[PDB]
Amino acid sequence: MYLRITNIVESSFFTKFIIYLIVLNGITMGLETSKTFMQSFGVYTTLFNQIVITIFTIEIILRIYVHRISFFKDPWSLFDFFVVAISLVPTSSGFEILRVLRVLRLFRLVTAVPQMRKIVSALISVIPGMLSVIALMTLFFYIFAIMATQLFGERFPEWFGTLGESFYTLFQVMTLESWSMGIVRPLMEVYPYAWVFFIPFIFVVTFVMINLVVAICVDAM
Amino acid sequence: MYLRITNIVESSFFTKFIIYLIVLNGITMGLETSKTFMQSFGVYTTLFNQIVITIFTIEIILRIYVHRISFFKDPWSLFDFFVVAISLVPTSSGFEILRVLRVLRLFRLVTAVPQMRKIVSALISVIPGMLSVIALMTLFFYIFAIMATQLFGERFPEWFGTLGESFYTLFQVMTLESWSMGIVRPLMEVYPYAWVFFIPFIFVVTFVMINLVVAICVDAM
Amino acid sequence: MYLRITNIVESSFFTKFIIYLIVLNGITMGLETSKTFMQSFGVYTTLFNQIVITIFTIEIILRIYVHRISFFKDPWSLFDFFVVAISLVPTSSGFEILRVLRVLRLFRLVTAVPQMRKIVSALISVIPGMLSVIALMTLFFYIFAIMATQLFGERFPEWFGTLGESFYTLFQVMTLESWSMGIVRPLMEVYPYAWVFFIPFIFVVTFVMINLVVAICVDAM
Amino acid sequence: MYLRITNIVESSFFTKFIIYLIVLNGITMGLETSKTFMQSFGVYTTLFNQIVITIFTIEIILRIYVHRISFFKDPWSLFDFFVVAISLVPTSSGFEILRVLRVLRLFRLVTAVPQMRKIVSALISVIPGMLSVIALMTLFFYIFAIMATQLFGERFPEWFGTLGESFYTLFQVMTLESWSMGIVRPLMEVYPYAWVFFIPFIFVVTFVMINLVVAICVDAM
Numbered sequence: 001m002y003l004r005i006t007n008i009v010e011s012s013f014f015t016k017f018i019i020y021l022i023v024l025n026g027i028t029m030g031l032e033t034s035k036t037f038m039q040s041f042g043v044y045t046t047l048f049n050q051i052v053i054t055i056f057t058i059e060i061i062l063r064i065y066v067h068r069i070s071f072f073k074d075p076w077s078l079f080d081f082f083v084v085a086i087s088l089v090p091t092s093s094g095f096e097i098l099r100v101l102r103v104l105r106l107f108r109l110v111t112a113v114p115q116m117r118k119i120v121s122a123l124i125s126v127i128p129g130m131l132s133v134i135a136l137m138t139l140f141f142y143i144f145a146i147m148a149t150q151l152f153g154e155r156f157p158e159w160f161g162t163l164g165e166s167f168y169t170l171f172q173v174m175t176l177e178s179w180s181m182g183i184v185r186p187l188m189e190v191y192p193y194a195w196v197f198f199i200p201f202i203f204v205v206t207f208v209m210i211n212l213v214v215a216i217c218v219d220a221m
Numbered sequence: 222m223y224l225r226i227t228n229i230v231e232s233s234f235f236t237k238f239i240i241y242l243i244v245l246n247g248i249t250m251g252l253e254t255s256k257t258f259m260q261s262f263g264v265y266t267t268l269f270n271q272i273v274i275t276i277f278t279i280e281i282i283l284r285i286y287v288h289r290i291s292f293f294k295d296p297w298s299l300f301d302f303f304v305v306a307i308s309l310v311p312t313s314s315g316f317e318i319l320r321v322l323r324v325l326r327l328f329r330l331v332t333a334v335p336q337m338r339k340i341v342s343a344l345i346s347v348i349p350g351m352l353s354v355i356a357l358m359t360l361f362f363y364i365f366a367i368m369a370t371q372l373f374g375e376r377f378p379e380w381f382g383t384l385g386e387s388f389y390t391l392f393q394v395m396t397l398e399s400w401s402m403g404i405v406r407p408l409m410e411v412y413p414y415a416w417v418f419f420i421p422f423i424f425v426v427t428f429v430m431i432n433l434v435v436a437i438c439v440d441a442m
Numbered sequence: 443m444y445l446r447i448t449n450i451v452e453s454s455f456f457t458k459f460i461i462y463l464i465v466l467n468g469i470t471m472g473l474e475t476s477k478t479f480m481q482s483f484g485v486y487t488t489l490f491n492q493i494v495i496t497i498f499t500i501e502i503i504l505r506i507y508v509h510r511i512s513f514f515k516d517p518w519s520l521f522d523f524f525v526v527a528i529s530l531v532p533t534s535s536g537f538e539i540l541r542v543l544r545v546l547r548l549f550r551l552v553t554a555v556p557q558m559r560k561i562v563s564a565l566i567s568v569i570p571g572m573l574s575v576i577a578l579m580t581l582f583f584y585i586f587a588i589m590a591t592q593l594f595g596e597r598f599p600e601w602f603g604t605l606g607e608s609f610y611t612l613f614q615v616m617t618l619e620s621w622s623m624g625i626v627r628p629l630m631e632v633y634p635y636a637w638v639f640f641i642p643f644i645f646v647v648t649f650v651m652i653n654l655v656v657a658i659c660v661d662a663m
Numbered sequence: 664m665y666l667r668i669t670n671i672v673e674s675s676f677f678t679k680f681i682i683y684l685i686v687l688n689g690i691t692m693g694l695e696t697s698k699t700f701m702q703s704f705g706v707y708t709t710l711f712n713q714i715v716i717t718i719f720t721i722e723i724i725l726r727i728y729v730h731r732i733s734f735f736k737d738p739w740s741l742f743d744f745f746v747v748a749i750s751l752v753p754t755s756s757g758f759e760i761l762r763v764l765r766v767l768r769l770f771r772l773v774t775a776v777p778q779m780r781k782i783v784s785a786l787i788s789v790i791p792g793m794l795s796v797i798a799l800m801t802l803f804f805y806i807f808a809i810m811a812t813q814l815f816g817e818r819f820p821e822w823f824g825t826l827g828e829s830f831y832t833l834f835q836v837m838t839l840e841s842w843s844m845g846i847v848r849p850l851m852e853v854y855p856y857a858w859v860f861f862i863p864f865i866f867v868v869t870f871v872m873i874n875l876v877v878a879i880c881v882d883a884m
Contacts, residue, residue, distance in 0.1 A: 006243045012867050013229045026363075029367050030367060030384055032362070033367055033370050033371065033383075033384045034384075042266050054399070060416075078255065100371055100372055101368075103364055103367050103368050104364070106360070106363065106364050106367075108362065109360060110357070110360065115353055115729075116353070116357060117362075118353065119354055119357050121355065123429065123432055126432065132778060132779075132781070132782045133782055135779070136773070136779060136782050136783065139769070139770075139772060139773070139779075142689075142693070142769070143766055143767070143770065146692055146693060146766050147694060147763055147766055149696050150696070150763055151763055162696075163693055163696045166417060168401075169820050172401040172402075174438070175397045175400070175401070175423070176397075176838045176840055177397055177398070177399065177400055177402065177840070178399070178401065178402040178403075178840065178841065179838070179840055180759070180831075180835040180838075180840050180841065181835075181840065181841040181845045182841075185437050195831060199834065202838070207786065208786065210876055210879055211786055211789065211879060213431055213434075213435075213876075213880075214876070214879045214880040214883055215883075216431065216432065216435045217434075217435040217438050217439055217880055218880060218883045220435055220439050221439045221442055221884065230653055247584075250588055251584070251588060254588060254591050254592070254604075254605045255605075264515055274511055321589055321592055321593055324585055324588050325585070327581070327584070327585050328585065330581060331578070331581070336574060337574075337577070337578060337581075339574070340574045340575055340578050341578065344649065344650065344653055347653065389622075389637060392641065393622040393623075394617045396621070396622075396644070397618070398618055398619070398620065398622050398623065399620065399622065399623040399624075403623045424571075431603060434652055434655075434656070437652055437653060437655040437656045438655075438659055438880075439657055441657075441660045442660050442663065468805075471809050472805070472826055475809055475812050475813065475825075475826045476795060476826075542810050542813055542814055543810075544808055545810050546806070548802070548805065548809075549802075549806065551802060552799070552802065557795055558795070558798070558799060558802075561795045561796055561799050562799065564876055565870070565871065568874065569703055584710050610858060612845075613862065614843040614844075616841045617700050617842070617843070617865070618839075618844050618846065619839055619840070619841065619842055620841070620843065620845075624844045637703040655873055655877075656875065657874075658873065658877045659876075659877040659880050659881055662848065662881050663881045663884055
């Protein structure tokens with residue numbers, strides 16, 4: 001029966017059918033959002049969901065047979081696998097994160113549809129040639145975060161009282177959001193030289209970003 | 222008479238004249254702004270308005286005869302058409318949106334004048350080679366908008382209570398405006414892990430935009 | 443005597459002497475800033491100023507003789523001329539703008555010193571191939587500014603009650619500063635669809651900027 | 664014994680060992696952050712600190728013998744030298760700045776590890792080809808800082824009362840943070856034309872930065 005199913009799976013109708021449900025369930029997720037719609041077509045949608053997830057487990061099963069080991073070595077199928085598994089976990093139990101994470105299946109539309117795979121693929125290919133810099137940066141944040149925690153955490157618990165607190169704040173300063181009016185001016189009210197810690201941080205972190213950008217452009221060209 | 226008129230439309234004086242009015246109506250449009258001016262040269266300008274729209278419906282007609290089917294296949298013509306059309310809709314009735322959209326006619330200066338067309342044409346030519354990414358992103362915003370609405374809309378109605386409110390807020394976060402001080406810090410007051418939903422979102426969204434820019438730059442090369 | 447002076451001006455000592463005073467007066471301007479220093483070396487500096495400006499008028503005079511018409515056709519000398527003229531205007535009379543504008547002479551250091559001329563020259567060379575786009579943009583702002591003045595100036599006098607008010611605000615939105623929390627969220631409290639006017643504005647204005655950037659990189663390469 | 668030691672320093676185990684401690688002291692540095700941890704493994708870590716700095720002064724010495732004059736001519740060596748030196752300065756005395764600067768040792772991980780050196784080296788190599796612009800800009804900030812101080816320092820002490828306060832504020836405006844809502848709008852409440860000093864400043868500063876980026880990108884190509 002292998003080739004029998006292998007012809008169903010490998011078929012056109014099959015994919016088109018799946019890609020059909022994606023956009024269908026996708027639209028349903030947006031309506032499941034409305035408190036009103038839920039009072040009307042409430043159940044209609046709830047059932048439509050259990051249906052799709054079933055149809056999708058069947059599909060993922062068929063695909064594994066038709067691909068055996070190859071499947072669990074294909075990034076795209078792996079995703080499809082993991083994304084459907086989450087959707088499988090009972091509506092209740094544990095936290096509703098999983099209940100929310102289910103919407104991640106709409107990402108199935110990137111997998112199932114070529115071109116999308118193309119862009120995503122092209123974007124990710126760039127990541128590798130950025131890890132050296134990304135690593136440099138994380139070391140940088142780690143070092144400055146530890147320094148900030150012990151330089152301002154005492155009098156500024158909210159923004160630097162912790163290593164993670166400091167990580168968050170330093171990240172914020174990097175995006176340049178409210179860094180002066182929101183964090184450094186207030187800080188200088190107690191530590192007049194805090195600017196000696198942040199301006200440099202801003203320069204180094206900005207310079208890198210600039211370079212990083214350059215890299216991608218020049219390397220792609 | 223075809224060739225008779227066709228020689229008027231195709232004439233220099235014709236274009237130069239139309240371009241003359243554009244800049245004139247254009248200038249008079251900025252005075253129509255002054256509460257004071259409107260108390261003096263008020264009517265002068267009002268009449269001058271009906272005059273220009275007249276002359277312009279004339280011009281648009283002639284052009285259609287001299288071009289027939291070709292006119293309604295010319296992007297620039299079409300624009301000129303739809304922009305003068307609006308300007309035609311009666312001063313009253315419905316809403317004043319239309320009454321405001323009239324100023325869109327000053328865009329005719331991009332049409333009537335070469336060079337401007339080159340830039341607009343050059344800018345737009347790039348759009349098509351961005352649709353794969355723009356689609357990817359929209360999908361992304363859609364998925365995260367749904368998640369956010371069901372994760373923070375209960376306690377944060379203003380920013381996430383709705384799918385559309387969430388779209389707006391997520392766009393704001395993308396432009397990085399007030400994302401930390403104004404949205405995420407407050408959010409973490411109730412949801413300590415909210416940073417796990419927004420930092421990644423900021424990374425993905427930022428990465429893409431970076432790439433997209435590379436593309437505009439690389440492809441032009 | 444021409445060649446006599448033409449040998450003084452054209453000399454090395456001459457330039458080095460001028461470039462010397464620049465950095466000298468430059469440092470003096472930074473001290474003239476201190477309320478304290480002004481209570482001590484107050485006059486010392488005030489005289490040192492009248493001296494330099496004199497020495498500089500002499501210099502600019504010599505240069506004109508040694509160059510005649512060529513002078514008033516050299517951008518760099520013209521600047522030097524205009525910048526010294528302002529410094530000439532009496533300390534009193536009119537407004538102190540001129541009194542402040544005097545500090546513009548420190549820009550003499552860009553003129554007098556090569557390399558600086560080089561960079562400035564290279565930066566400005568780019569401007570020309572940006573005017574088409576810059577023009578497009580100014581038209582854009584003009585049109586949207588007029589629209590905003592008549593769409594929100596009534597209920598938001600501070601930010602849109604005027605054509606110029608609107609120009610300023612729209613510029614702010616372009617730099618993306620407080621555009622949502624600061625201007626559009628508040629605006630939507632009265633005009634729920636204001637986002638339909640600003641998001642597009644943000645996209646168009648951002649797209650252009652992105653392109654503009656690309657241009658310079660690609661054209662320079 | 665030269666070659667005897669020279670074979671230890673030059674050995675793999677030597678480097679791997681040093682790199683081992685870096686990551687160890689590194690990890691222990693993030694725990695030294697926890698108020699709690701310090702109440703438990705408090706001393707454990709404290710002693711482990713004196714141990715590492717010891718081992719490191721040893722390592723730095725050996726290296727100097729095996730390299731002599733070459734050591735104090737190696738940027739990376741020098742860094743390792745000056746970073747361990749600080750870490751040597753007694754826990755007490757003077758200020759704890761030094762006590763905090765100790766964490767800078769984790770930067771040794773950039774030194775001791777190749778690849779990291781490549782990036783840092785690659786990033787820095789670009790700096791030199793930016794000094795002409797960086798000089799131009801600094802001149803610019805200096806001139807505008809002086810002007811601003813004498814134009815708004817009287818009524819706006821916090822942001823412009825001083826040459827240095829002005830430097831800080833102008834830098835903030837350059838990063839575009841809160842420049843309108845937080846600085847210029849308030850300013851215009853007393854000085855209606857302040858927009859004539861800041862928009863141009865924003866244009867010049869933005870233009871340059873754009874170019875500077877082009878340079879990093881173009882030159883790498």
